[PDB]
Structure formats: structure tokens, C-alpha cells
Design an enzyme around this catalytic site. Structure first.
Site, PDB file in Angstrom:
ATOM      1  N   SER A 273      48.303  38.756  37.492  1.00 27.77           N
ATOM      2  CA  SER A 273      49.452  38.161  38.161  1.00 27.77           C
ATOM      3  C   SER A 273      50.485  37.587  37.183  1.00 27.77           C
ATOM      4  O   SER A 273      51.437  36.945  37.625  1.00 27.77           O
ATOM      5  CB  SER A 273      49.003  37.083  39.176  1.00 27.77           C
ATOM      6  OG  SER A 273      48.407  35.933  38.577  1.00 27.77           O
ATOM      7  N   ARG A 327      41.367  32.860  34.120  1.00 31.13           N
ATOM      8  CA  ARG A 327      41.090  34.297  34.073  1.00 31.13           C
ATOM      9  C   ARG A 327      41.729  34.858  32.807  1.00 31.13           C
ATOM     10  O   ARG A 327      42.960  34.981  32.723  1.00 31.13           O
ATOM     11  CB  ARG A 327      41.582  35.057  35.305  1.00 31.13           C
ATOM     12  CG  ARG A 327      41.230  36.560  35.192  1.00 31.13           C
ATOM     13  CD  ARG A 327      41.184  37.328  36.537  1.00 31.13           C
ATOM     14  NE  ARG A 327      42.514  37.501  37.113  1.00 31.13           N
ATOM     15  CZ  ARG A 327      42.782  38.248  38.186  1.00 31.13           C
ATOM     16  NH1 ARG A 327      41.821  38.927  38.802  1.00 31.13           N
ATOM     17  NH2 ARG A 327      44.027  38.345  38.625  1.00 31.13           N
ATOM     18  N   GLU A 419      34.865  44.871  39.896  1.00 35.21           N
ATOM     19  CA  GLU A 419      36.093  45.538  40.301  1.00 35.21           C
ATOM     20  C   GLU A 419      36.269  46.877  39.599  1.00 35.21           C
ATOM     21  O   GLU A 419      37.388  47.415  39.576  1.00 35.21           O
ATOM     22  CB  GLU A 419      37.297  44.640  40.070  1.00 35.21           C
ATOM     23  CG  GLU A 419      37.589  44.270  38.585  1.00 35.21           C
ATOM     24  CD  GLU A 419      38.685  43.260  38.483  1.00 35.21           C
ATOM     25  OE1 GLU A 419      38.879  42.675  37.397  1.00 35.21           O
ATOM     26  OE2 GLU A 419      39.388  43.064  39.488  1.00 35.21           O
ATOM     27  N   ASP A 447      41.468  46.350  42.420  1.00 38.45           N
ATOM     28  CA  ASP A 447      41.121  47.075  41.197  1.00 38.45           C
ATOM     29  C   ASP A 447      40.038  48.103  41.468  1.00 38.45           C
ATOM     30  O   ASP A 447      40.103  49.238  40.975  1.00 38.45           O
ATOM     31  CB  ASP A 447      40.651  46.109  40.111  1.00 38.45           C
ATOM     32  CG  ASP A 447      41.772  45.717  39.154  1.00 38.45           C
ATOM     33  OD1 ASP A 447      41.901  44.510  38.871  1.00 38.45           O
ATOM     34  OD2 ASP A 447      42.515  46.622  38.699  1.00 38.45           O
ATOM     35  N   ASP A 618      50.375  42.467  42.691  1.00 32.64           N
ATOM     36  CA  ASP A 618      50.166  42.311  41.254  1.00 32.64           C
ATOM     37  C   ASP A 618      49.625  43.636  40.721  1.00 32.64           C
ATOM     38  O   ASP A 618      49.659  44.656  41.417  1.00 32.64           O
ATOM     39  CB  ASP A 618      49.335  41.048  40.960  1.00 32.64           C
ATOM     40  CG  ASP A 618      47.825  41.251  41.056  1.00 32.64           C
ATOM     41  OD1 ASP A 618      47.329  42.285  41.566  1.00 32.64           O
ATOM     42  OD2 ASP A 618      47.117  40.312  40.620  1.00 32.64           O
TER      43      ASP A 618
HETATM   44  O1  LIG Z   1      41.292  42.871  43.804  1.00 37.72           O
HETATM   45  C1  LIG Z   1      41.486  42.720  42.601  1.00 37.72           C
HETATM   46  O2  LIG Z   1      41.368  43.573  41.712  1.00 37.72           O
HETATM   47  C2  LIG Z   1      41.945  41.306  42.116  1.00 37.72           C
HETATM   48  O3  LIG Z   1      41.684  40.960  40.832  1.00 37.72           O
HETATM   49  C3  LIG Z   1      42.906  40.617  42.846  1.00 37.72           C
HETATM   50  C4  LIG Z   1      44.121  40.083  42.214  1.00 37.72           C
HETATM   51  O4  LIG Z   1      44.197  39.867  41.062  1.00 37.72           O
HETATM   52  C5  LIG Z   1      45.368  39.820  43.083  1.00 37.72           C
HETATM   53  C6  LIG Z   1      45.892  40.784  43.968  1.00 37.72           C
HETATM   54  C7  LIG Z   1      47.041  40.493  44.713  1.00 37.72           C
HETATM   55  C8  LIG Z   1      47.701  39.261  44.607  1.00 37.72           C
HETATM   56  C9  LIG Z   1      47.197  38.294  43.743  1.00 37.72           C
HETATM   57  O5  LIG Z   1      47.818  37.069  43.608  1.00 37.72           O
HETATM   58  C10 LIG Z   1      46.042  38.608  42.989  1.00 37.72           C
HETATM   59 BR1  LIG Z   1      45.361  37.237  41.832  1.00 37.72          BR
HETATM   60 MG   LIG Z   2      41.450  42.698  39.673  1.00 34.20          MG
END
Ligand SMILES: O=C(O)/C(O)=C/C(=O)c1cccc(O)c1Br
Ligand SMILES: [Mg+2]
Ligand SMILES: [Mg+2]
Ligand SMILES: [Mg+2]
Ligand SMILES: [Mg+2]
EC number: 2.3.3.9
Length: 712
Positions: A273, A327, A419, A447, A618
Site C-alpha cells: 500500500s 509489514r 499469499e 496476492d 493496492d
Molecule cells: O490480499 C493480499 O494479498 C493483501 O496483502 C492485502 C493487501 O495488502 C491490501 C489490498 C487492498 C487494499 C489494502 O489496503 C491492502 Br493492505
Molecule cells: Mg498481499
């Protein structure tokens, strides 16, 4: 511009930041720190590169395997034995229990929302840290959970018809979460504390709680408290009592608000993000992480703990802030914030471990009181790992960083993102590789979908992006993650987490459907805002996650065959208009996200899709869209003219959606002059050739290109 330490050439802005801002107060000698950086980088870079090469070799073998397949229905027995032969599918170890110790109660025990925020945005990061407590009234009044129907519309001024619906919704919440022995909170006229237990006044009689143990404390005098503190499923609820307030004056018991413990933990994000492509960007993020851990980040400041009176009359306090994870980036990228003597960039994940680890020391010590872990841990989310050897590498990296920082071994804990497919199918081995460090697993499903598409890129055209959520592989993946977590003893020791709600404006929908995640036994799941945290907290009051997890223990609900079911489309699946909609939708979401990434360095953006649904985007959602279009182009579902035309058609619609916005430069009409447009195009047309379909190589290159142009 650079500082020589051993074999490293450190960008001056980073050298200065670490020496002048990060190191003071840690009692770490600067020369010893930088010698540690040099030695860790030198020692661990070979294995880091080797792991990345292994990903490429495995993907090449799988690509070729699919190209040499003759039989239409994939022989799953042949496929599974092939993945086993090449070392992709590894043996499952024997059962074990994790031994991670020194972990805070917010992670081992409390089920509740987990908020993720870009660390480069100081104001969002501050609001996220402060989101441990949030107003239910504000969350209900300000969103579509309360429909804007019958005179309940929002306007410039407070609408009492809407406010009364907010109040009634919250009263029903109380009845459902902390029920009275008789009667309803809707008919309450007052609250008192008598002989250490809560007494609720009804018009006819008085009553106590059906479970008086849910009464956790109060503020003000026990005979006319200014607030009443309840607890349910380990989460606190605070009824603010103030008849002199505008809301409370109209309330039958003078209630002003209902405060929910909301974002129990927060992940300050350096990865998907944020957009950070050089030392200057990294330092902005590190400095915010430093301000959070020292307690002095300000735009508007961090909250202190909350003081209560116990039901019996003594004093106690409750944490005022969300317990913070960071993260880090994963194993892939390098960053020129440090280069070696030969000019090679240093792995960014290695740098993040050293620098975010160093900075996190400040959160283990007095601000007043120390900000973060009272038990002495540092909590790092490690994303995008592929299999147990990559998890082992992260653990070795953390061990070496702990030595450099002088910290106890295993101080740096790991939240494992599940992921990537090679982690999914080896998840038990991945947890075991981190058995003394792991504090959560989480299904990063976006992901994971991108990796699903890239891994089987050569097998055929995949289903539409919107169909992925119902595919067999993803349902197995979610259940498998919970099963492995519970089997490794996560209940009472580590979080079992699920993924992000992205439809920021559809909070009624989130309240309706996101309850599935705690019903599935997840002790946490991701939200993108403090408001969404407060609303998602409702689900943990309705669902007894500890009970659900106990009921799930021992179950083996996903087979390897289900996990490996590739989401291929059936032939003849789509009419021309359906294909057109998928292409346009994906191009719009790609362009909307990429244009603010490349031109403005914004790594998370709300982007309306082709159905005008506001989606929080993101890099992971970008990975899906670009990989899906790359897959459709690869198998002839669409032509190169279709892609270019769709990009050209959607680009001026993105330009219009951004119009003001004064830092926005339009992509249309000179598409071949727009670095952002060309990045979007490259993500699609070169998507099949990106490593595991990752978007960072192109994004970082194109963002650096944009910065270089703005500099001359
Ligand atoms: O599902 C993944 O791979 C995961 O790591 C989620 C995200 O990073 C994400 C996805 C959309 C908006 C947001 O704020 C974020 Br933090
Ligand atoms: Mg991810
Ligand atoms: Mg190839
Ligand atoms: Mg489909
Ligand atoms: Mg219950």
C-alpha cells in the site's frame, strides 16, 4: 551522495536518518550497527538471490509442463506427482505445536479487527494507531449501514431521524451482546453501580446483566456513572452517559455514544500500500515508524491509556492504542538506498529487517509509558514468501538482525502471509519453519489470486476476475489455512487471519457478509479504515471465535487436489460483451491505480470500477488485473488491439475522475508521452514475463523514471 561502510555505499539521507534519528536512545554504537549491516548484507544476499532463482526455475518447469500437455482435462495425479518431483510440493511434517512466547494478549487471545495502513501517510498511521477505540455512532451515522431512506438522509446538519436509527441500532447491539436479565437496553432510563454490579433502570423495574461478569468497570461516581464498561468475547464496549450532550439530551437514558474496542492490532505497511522507490521514500516511511514507536508522531497525537474504576471500586487501566505490527517488503526487490561497490542494489527486505527492527526498539521503552509491546516483542509481517525455505531464510535474517541490534533471540516475531501457492500447499512446513517466531498466518487472498493466475499462466485462459472468489481452489485455500493454524496450536497462541474488505463505501454489505470470516474461525481479519474496524468489531460480538476454533479442531477440510484445482474457464464461456466488460473493467482499475502510483507516489488509492464501486486498490489487486489480462492475451481471448483500445478508452475516464487534484497530469491524449500510461500498458503486455507476476519491477522503474523527468 553516498557513504562508504565496508562494501556498502549508503545514500546520505539514509545514513543521516539512522545516525541522527533511529540510533540515539537504543544504546547501539553507530559504527557497530553499520558494520553489522555490512556483514548481514554480505552474508545473506547469496541465499536471497538463490531463493529468487529457485522461484524462476520452478515456474519455468511448470510453464513447460503445461505446454507439453495433450489431454484436455488435466490429469491431477500426474500434475501432483510432477510438483512433488520438482520440489514444489514438499512432504508434510509431523504434527507439532508452536512455541512462540512473549507475545501480547492482543495477538494470543483477543479476536478482533486488524487494520492495515500505509506507513508513509502520517495522518492515516496516527488515526490507525488511535483506532483501538472508535465511536459506533459515528461509524453508523456516517456510512450506509443506516440506509438513507425515509428522511434518514445525511445533510449539512445533524438529522435526528437518522440519529434515532443510529441509537436504536446500537441499543439492539447491546441487547444482543450484553443482554439484560429482563427487558431491553432500548427501554433503559439510567445506569448505576450498586454493590459492585451493574443495575439498569427500566420504566417499570430495575434489572442487572444476564451474565454480570460482562460488567467490566465504569467512570465517575458509581451512583451516576459518566460511563459503563462492558466486555464480551474479550472485547470492550463503553456506554458514554452524558445527558448534557446534544445526543444525550434526546436519549431516554442520556446516552451520548457507544464506544467499541475496534482495531485491536494495526499493521503499519511498508509493502503493497505504499510507493517507495529510493532512499528518500524509505526514510519518510522509517521516520513515521520511528515517530509511532517513540510516541511523538504528530500532525493530532497518539492516545494514552484509558482509566477505569473496577466494579468493586479499585482503579485499573486499558490500552489506548492499537498494538502495532510493521509489514516489511518481501524477498524480491532491491533498492538503491544502499548499493555495493560494484553498484548492485541491496535487497530491500534485508534493509527493512535491519531498519524497522532497529526503530522498533523505541517501542519497547518509555515514550510516558512504553508505546507498544509490554512483553518485549517486535512484530513484523513478512509478505510474499514462497515455501518453507523462504520462511527459514526470514527467520535466519531476523536472528542475524537481533544479533546486530543486541536484542534477545526471537524478539522479532513473524506474521506469515499465506499469499503464494507454494506456501499454501506447504503451509504446515512453513509454520514449522517459524515455530518459535510465528504470531499469525493470514490468507492474503488477493496476492494469492495473482499467484494462482501466474503459476498456471500456460495452462489456459482463467475465469473472469469476479468469478475467482467462488472457485474451488480459493475455498480450499481459506479452509486449509485455518486447519493448519489450529493444528499447529494457534488457538490461544497466535492469530488466524483473513483478508481485506476493499469496498470502502459498502459498509452495509461489509456488516452483512464479512461475518463469514470469524464464523470460519478467523481470530482476525483485515479492514482498511478505523470506521471499518469499528463496524467489523460487531462481528466478533456476534461470533464466539474461541468456540468456533474449538469446534474446528482436528478437522481436515481441504485436500491437496482441491488446493491444486486450477481456475480454468470452460470453452465458449463468454459473449463478446462479457469479454469487453472484463477488459474495460481491468484496464480502468489498472490505470486508476497506476497513474497515482507513478505520477504521485501514492501506493493505495480508492478507484471506482466499471460498475462505479469504489475499490481500495493496492499492488495485489493490480497483480490480479494485470495477470488476468496477460493470461487472456496469452491464450487468444483478446487481441493486442483490444488491450490498447481499452486502455485508450479508459484513460480519459481516469483523467476525468482525477481532474482536481492539482498535482494530476492527464494521460490523454498523448498516451505515448505518459510514463504512467506506458507503465499500465507494460504491466499487461509484459505481465507473463514478470517474476511470479509481481508488479514492483515495472512500478519501481516507471516511478523512478517519472522522478528523473520531474527533476530535469
Ligand atoms: O490480499 C493480499 O494479498 C493483501 O496483502 C492485502 C493487501 O495488502 C491490501 C489490498 C487492498 C487494499 C489494502 O489496503 C491492502 Br493492505
Ligand atoms: Mg498481499
Ligand atoms: Mg517462458
Ligand atoms: Mg468466468
Ligand atoms: Mg457469547
Amino acid at each position: 551522495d553516498r557513504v562508504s561502510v565496508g562494501n556498502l555505499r549508503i545514500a546520505r539521507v539514509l545514513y543521516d536518518f539512522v545516525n541522527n534519528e533511529a540510533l540515539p536512545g537504543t544504546d547501539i554504537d553507530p559504527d557497530s550497527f553499520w558494520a553489522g549491516v555490512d556483514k548481514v548484507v554480505a552474508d545473506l544476499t547469496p541465499q536471497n538471490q538463490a531463493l529468487l532463482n529457485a522461484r524462476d526455475e520452478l515456474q519455468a518447469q511448470i510453464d513447460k509442463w503445461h505446454r507439453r500437455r495433450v489431454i484436455e482435462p488435466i490429469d491431477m495425479d500426474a500434475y501432483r506427482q510432477f510438483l512433488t518431483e520438482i520440489g514444489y510440493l514438499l512432504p508434510e511434517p509431523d504434527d507439532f505445536t508452536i512455541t512462540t512466547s512473549g507475545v501480547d494478549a492482543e495477538i494470543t487471545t483477543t479476536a478482533g479487527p486488524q487494520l492495515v495502513v500505509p506507513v508513509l501517510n502520517a495522518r492515516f498511521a496516527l488515526n490507525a494507531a488511535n483506532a483501538r477505540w472508535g465511536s459506533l455512532y459515528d461509524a453508523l451515522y456516517g456510512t450506509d449501514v443506516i440506509p438513507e431512506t425515509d428522511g434518514a438522509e445525511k445533510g449539512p446538519t445533524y438529522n435526528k431521524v437518522r440519529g434515532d436509527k443510529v441509537i436504536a441500532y446500537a441499543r439492539k447491539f447491546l441487547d444482543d451482546s450484553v443482554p439484560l436479565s429482563s427487558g431491553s437496553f432500548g427501554d433503559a432510563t439510567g445506569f448505576t453501580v450498586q454493590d459492585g454490579q451493574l443495575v439498569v433502570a427500566l420504566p417499570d423495574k430495575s434489572t442487572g446483566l444476564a451474565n454480570p461478569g460482562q460488567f467490566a468497570g465504569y467512570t465517575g461516581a458509581a451512583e451516576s456513572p459518566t460511563s459503563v464498561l462492558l466486555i464480551n468475547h474479550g472485547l470492550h464496549i463503553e456506554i458514554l452517559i452524558d445527558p448534557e450532550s446534544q445526543v444525550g439530551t434526546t436519549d431516554r437514558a442520556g446516552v451520548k455514544d457507544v464506544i467499541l474496542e475496534s482495531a485491536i492490532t494495526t499493521i503499519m505497511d511498508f509493502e503493497d500500500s505504499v510507493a517507495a522507490v529510493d532512499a528518500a521514500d524509505k526514510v519518510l516511511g522509517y521516520r513515521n515508524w520511528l515517530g509511532l514507536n517513540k510516541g511523538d508522531l504528530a500532525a493530532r497525537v497518539l492516545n494514552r491509556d484509558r482509566n477505569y474504576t473496577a466494579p468493586g471500586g479499585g482503579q485499573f487501566t486499558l490500552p489506548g492504542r492499537s498494538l502495532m505490527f510493521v509489514r516489511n517488503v518481501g524477498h524480491l526487490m532491491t533498492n538503491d538506498a544502499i548499493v555495493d561497490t560494484d553498484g548492485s542494489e541491496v535487497f530491500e527486505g534485508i534493509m527493512d529487517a535491519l531498519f524497522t527492527g532497529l526503530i522498533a526498539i523505541h517501542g519497547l521503552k518509555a515514550s510516558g509509558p512504553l508505546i507498544n509491546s509490554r512483553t518485549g516483542s517486535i512484530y513484523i509481517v513478512k509478505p510474499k514468501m514462497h515455501g518453507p525455505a523462504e520462511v527459514a531464510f526470514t527467520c535466519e535474517l531476523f536472528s542475524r538482525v537481533e544479533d546486530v541490534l543486541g536484542l534477545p533471540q526471537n524478539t522479532m516475531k513473524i506474521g506469515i502471509m499465506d499469499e503464494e501457492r507454494r506456501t499454501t500447499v506447504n503451509l504446515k512446513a512453513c509454520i514449522k519453519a517459524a515455530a518459535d517466531r510465528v504470531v499469525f498466518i493470514n490468507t492474503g487472498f488477493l496476492d494469492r489470486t495473482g499467484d494462482e493466475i501466474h503459476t498456471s499462466m500456460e495452462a489456459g485462459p482463467m475465469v473472469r476476475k469476479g468469478t475467482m472468489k467462488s472457485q474451488p481452489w480459493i475455498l480450499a485455500y481459506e479452509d486449509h489455512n485455518v486447519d493448519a493454524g489450529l493444528a499447529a496450536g494457534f488457538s490461544g497462541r497466535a492469530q488466524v487471519g483473513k483478508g481485506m474488505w476493499t469496498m470502502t463505501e459498502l459498509m452495509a454489505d461489509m456488516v452483512e457478509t464479512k461475518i463469514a470470516q470469524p464464523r470460519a474461525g478467523a481470530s482476525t481479519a483485515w479492514v482498511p479504515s478505523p470506521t471499518a474496524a469499528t463496524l467489523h468489531a460487531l462481528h466478533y460480538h456476534q461470533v464466539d471465535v474461541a468456540a468456533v476454533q474449538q469446534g474446528l479442531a482436528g478437522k481436515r477440510r481441504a485436500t491437496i487436489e482441491q488446493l491444486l484445482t486450477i481456475p480454468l474457464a470452460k470453452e465458449l464461456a463468454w459473449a463478446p460483451d462479457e469479454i469487453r466488460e472484463e477488459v474495460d473493467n481491468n484496464c480502468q482499475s489498472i490505470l486508476g491505480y497506476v497513474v497515482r502510483w507513478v505520477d504521485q507516489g501514492v501506493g493505495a488509492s480508492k478507484v471506482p470500477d466499471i460498475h462505479d464501486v469504489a475499490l481500495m486498490e493496492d499492488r495485489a489487486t493490480l497483480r490480479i488485473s494485470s495477470q488476468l489480462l496477460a493470461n487472456w492475451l496469452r491464450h487468444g481471448v483478446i487481441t493486442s488491439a483490444d488491450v490498447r483500445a481499452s486502455l485508450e478508452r479508459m484513460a480519459p475516464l481516469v483523467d476525468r475522475q482525477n481532474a482536481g487534484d492539482v498535482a494530476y497530469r492527464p494521460m490523454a491524449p498523448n498516451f505515448d508521452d505518459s510514463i504512467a500510461f506506458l507503465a499500465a500498458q507494460e504491466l499487461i503486455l509484459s505481465g507473463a514475463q514478470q517474476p511470479n507476476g509481481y508488479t514492483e519491477p515495472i512500478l519501481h522503474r516507471r516511478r523512478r523514471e517519472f522522478k528523473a523527468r520531474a527533476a530535469e
